[model samples]
Target chain A: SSTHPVFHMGEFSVCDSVSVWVGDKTTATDIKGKEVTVLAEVNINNSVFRQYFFETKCRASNPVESGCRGIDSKHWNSYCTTTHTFVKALTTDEKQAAWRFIRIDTACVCVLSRKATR
Target chain B: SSTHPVFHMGEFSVCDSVSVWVGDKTTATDIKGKEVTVLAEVNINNSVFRQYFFETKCRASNPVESGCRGIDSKHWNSYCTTTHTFVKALTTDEKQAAWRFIRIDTACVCVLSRKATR
Candidate 1:
């Protein structure tokens, strides 16, 4: 049938968080040249939906600011089957912290700005 | 506050995946020139944590290949605070299909290729 993530692509099985590369040939290739690492079993709690790329950048702001460095946001960037890993923005501890600021009622589907991308 | 998406900025709040713009000024600005749309209230079940940008691309594949089109992959691409909306890959119907392929045991943190960015 369709490629519904049937078998493991590298290390991603069912419910696994896999990192892939993304971007144009030039950019994607550029990212592939860097050292990358996932925060390891990080968990973003109370998530109603899979996060888009933008959210990762925003949420990851906490950790990135905390001096946890390896890959900058550029390497984490993606496009297609290139090189980039989309990990949960929060580690286990970060999840607990987010929980305090968020609740079940916090669920939503925000209406994005239809404005032309400036 | 901590800018954790408190009051709706335009149309976002806590517990929501607020689309943010990312990428260098040139690329980001090009995207800001397009029309974008969120799939609307799409829920991805069995998702223990929020998905990262790459997952959205992989998941959204079904919808894109199935001919549901609006913004092409380029516009959805992001880097930093620019303009990019990362919505759940599956719509209601897609989630059901993904559910069949995925389960709770599917949780994971894949070791991304640390290959130097080419």
Candidate 2:
């Protein structure tokens, strides 16, 4: 379970598409996709909310779930990675860079930063 | 324009409704609606991301946009509030708990936590 602030809505809510890309900072020279830009916006009924971009990579998850499956989408079995080159092949220790994110749009309105997808 | 990491989609992105609430630490006694439980989830064409809840209130907004008019709905003119009693009436400065938010879901997946509406 992840924890993040979200505005309330009626029982009718819809989030159409969701995707992600993962990278690691094993070496300062091998950092290709560790940090990427995430641009999300809404064109809708109440507030057309949007965040132009924010930097996120392998981060922390203790304050998140103590059970939230962060950045890894394949092995729903481990909380951390094991490989030195691939976030997909890292070790399952409790001290690696835990995956976390933060969203800060214009106007200072904020949203969330919880655990990742399983 | 706020900034957050969102998955890529076709030209068909839809976020139907949006709403918000604000609070502060002036008098921790009458914390009526200052804190809320926002149960947001998607029943759609992608991942049904959901964050049971995260705490928020009168906060900071600096690294945010350096234009992210935050939390208030009336004075899109000021970045911060003025009135001591009502966040709706607080003073607008760069320091008095600038508003900001972060969104994280069940998985380590994230969406948007950009600026507030105009």
Candidate 3:
């Protein structure tokens, strides 16, 4: 299950958009399609969050036993390219990066041109 | 202007929301109301993003010249409280934190209670 924060009707809630399988091959497609940036990759052991975006691609899962259905959209089954912008306030300690994205064919991965789309 | 990523009608874009005054006394109210979580704060000075959340609340702006409207909602002008959960894949490097939150009166600041609301 992929979880994120959402506000609905003035109520704050945590939401999970889950997919069945999440390999680089699969997730890249789903993520790249909607995300313009990937700030970093994180993985889980038992009780910790690890960063893993160094010359590699990472993976995760959403299981039936975990109460999440496999992703139901075929369109969502493809690769998505992503981008992000982090923001900070005075003195540089307070900041946030906004994650924006797009879906590109894996062919473009090798090109790595920042000008894929605006 | 405050910048963040937003997706609308399947198109990717960056959006800015501006506020007038962003002092601790004022900003604490607008953010605490709808944001269940605030991961960090960023401020811009002459085009550089600065982080400033270490024992401090940061500030930013959205000027009419910068294409943002000062926040107009009275409700938005009040203080708000927030929370977050970060998720990642295999080795713990790739992670995304879901920011969830609740609104608490400033009185609770002294308590630093995690159980303010669900």
* Reference-based TM-score of each model: 0.16, 0.17, 0.18
Give per-residue lDDT, candidate 1, residue A63. 30
Each prediction's DockQ? 0.09, 0.02, 0.05
lDDT of 3 at B35: 24
State model 2's lDDT: 0.23
lDDT, candidate 3, B4-99, per-residue tens: 221222231111211221123212212233322232332222232212121211122212232112212221211122222121111111143332
Candidate 1 lDDT tens digits, A1-118: 4443323322211011122222111111112232222222223444342222221112222233311122222322211111123322221222232211111111111122222222
User: Taking the true A–B contacts (Cα pairs closer than 8 Å), what share appears in each candidate?
Assistant: 0.13, 0.00, 0.02
| Model 1 misplaced regions, further than 4 Å | A1-118, B1-82, B92-118
Candidate whose lDDT is highest = 2
Ordered by lDDT, highest first, the candidates read 2, 1, 3
lDDT of 1: 0.22
Show the lowest summed lDDT stretch of 10 residues, model 2 chain A: A9-18
The TM-score-based order of candidates, best leading, equals: 3, 2, 1
Per-residue lDDT for B27-109 in model 1, tens only?
A: 11112232222222223444333232222112222233311122222312111111123222322232232211111111111
